[PDB]
Write a protein that binds this ligand. Structure first.
Ligand code: TOR
Ligand code: ZN
Length: 256
């Protein structure tokens, strides 16, 4: 699977029927229709830089994995009663600065989007087990607006030269991804899914209202990553964001 014309988002329903489900992500957040929930507690993240493990080129994107054998790096608060264990973060981008984010706010598309994923370690004992549970995954989404260079992305960006082609991987250690989050953690939350196959509707989304910046050149670096295996003709990763999906009755709650 990928985002090309033949194997993109529009063709995912073929092997994954859940793609047309009632809890799919991403979605367009309409602020006039969100419901402020007074019960929503503040988002609390506490990550240990030592849990950073490695970075991998998966063909359609790349992601940074974290050791998730214990609760050294966790997420709490918000709409959760359980503690969620950090295990990965990655980005989504588009072919041009005009688009790239997965979620949209009042129809506005941003240039990219950061996803920090965690799994429910209070109820399950592994990502594999939690991945398909309705309450198994928690993912923070941060909209990235094209503008000033984001120094926080530096380490991530510098590591890409070692995993240029599909399947390459390299250690990525000593990094706390909470340093990538916006100053304010006011958020929107709704029940959704993974935005890439298998598309399980096991994700409780936490979308930050505040965006973070990224320069046009930094985005270029993402797009310069290759989706081909070493040796083949270079084929740049131009985009990997899935179109917004129907809310189908779901209510998007706001912590503010
Ligand atoms: C690079 C990218 C998109 O992110 C990886 C992998 C497969 O899908 C994901 C999607 O997670 S998401 N986009 O719902 O946060 O689901 C998991 C299993 C959480 O890993 C994510 O590809
Ligand atoms: Zn994602």
């Amino acid at each position: 699977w990928g985002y090309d014309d033949k194997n993109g988002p529009e063709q995912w329903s073929k092997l994954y029927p859940i793609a047309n489900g009632n809890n799919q992500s991403p979605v367009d957040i309409k602020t006039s229709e969100t419901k402020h929930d007074t019960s929503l507690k503040p988002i609390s993240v506490s990550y240990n830089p030592a849990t950073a493990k490695e970075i991998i080129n998966v063909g359609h994107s790349f992601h940074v994995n974290f050791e998730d054998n214990d609760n050294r790096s966790v997420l709490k608060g918000g709409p959760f009663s359980d503690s969620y264990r950090l295990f990965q973060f990655h980005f989504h981008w588009g072919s041009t600065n005009e688009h790239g984010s997965e979620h949209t706010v009042d129809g506005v598309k941003y240039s990219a989007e950061l996803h920090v994923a965690h799994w429910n370690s209070a109820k399950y004992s592994s990502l594999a087990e939690a991945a398909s549970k309705a309450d198994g995954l928690a993912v923070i989404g941060v909209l990235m607006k094209v503008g000033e260079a984001n120094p926080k992305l530096q380490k991530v960006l510098d590591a890409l030269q070692a995993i240029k082609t599909k399947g390459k991987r390299a250690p990525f250690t000593n990094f706390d991804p909470s340093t990538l989050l916006p100053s304010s953690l006011d958020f929107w939350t709704y029940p959704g899914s993974l935005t890439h196959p298998p598309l399980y509707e096991s994700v409780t989304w936490i979308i930050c209202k505040e965006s973070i910046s990224v320069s046009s050149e930094q985005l270029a670096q993402f797009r310069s990553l290759l989706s081909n295996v070493e040796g083949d003709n270079a084929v740049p990763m131009q985009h990997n964001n899935r179109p917004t999906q129907p809310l189908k009755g779901r209510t998007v709650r706001a912590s503010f």
